[PDB]
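Quick one from the shared queue. A colleague (R.T.) flagged Protein LlR18A as missing a structural entry in our internal table.

Convert sequence to structure tokens.
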Amino acid sequence: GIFAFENEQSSTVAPAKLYKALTKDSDEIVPKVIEPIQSVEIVEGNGGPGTIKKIIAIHTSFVLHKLDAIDEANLTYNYSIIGGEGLDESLEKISYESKILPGPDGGSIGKINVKFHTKGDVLSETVRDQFKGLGLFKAIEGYVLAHPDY
């Protein structure tokens, strides 16, 4: 099954600035804002679509991310959680399709479409009770909010 949800968050951060933090600068920001994460390592690829990242955290553990698509001109980026810690056993992957829109007063709107790829025909209550859709956006956006000059 594929169960899709739409999440939205307004931000005061300028669109291109927010998008940069979420894409080009994510690997640097993530280990700061989520303390147990030590590093984000590119294990396959050149940073564009198709690129695989290993997120290493400390017990040492890892999570795998795949960059599925990116379109800087349209402030869109798509990535998936494809293995490792924090991926429910009922799930093949979690995919995120995000777009940063202009908002009023030079702000932004984050449009986040989260897709749960389930092994079965049901999205469990445990998964539904998830912040899986907005968590990482929220942590990065809050970092740039507080630290525009990072």
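The first strand starts at residue 2 and ends at 11.
The radius of gyration is 15 Å.
Added to the table.
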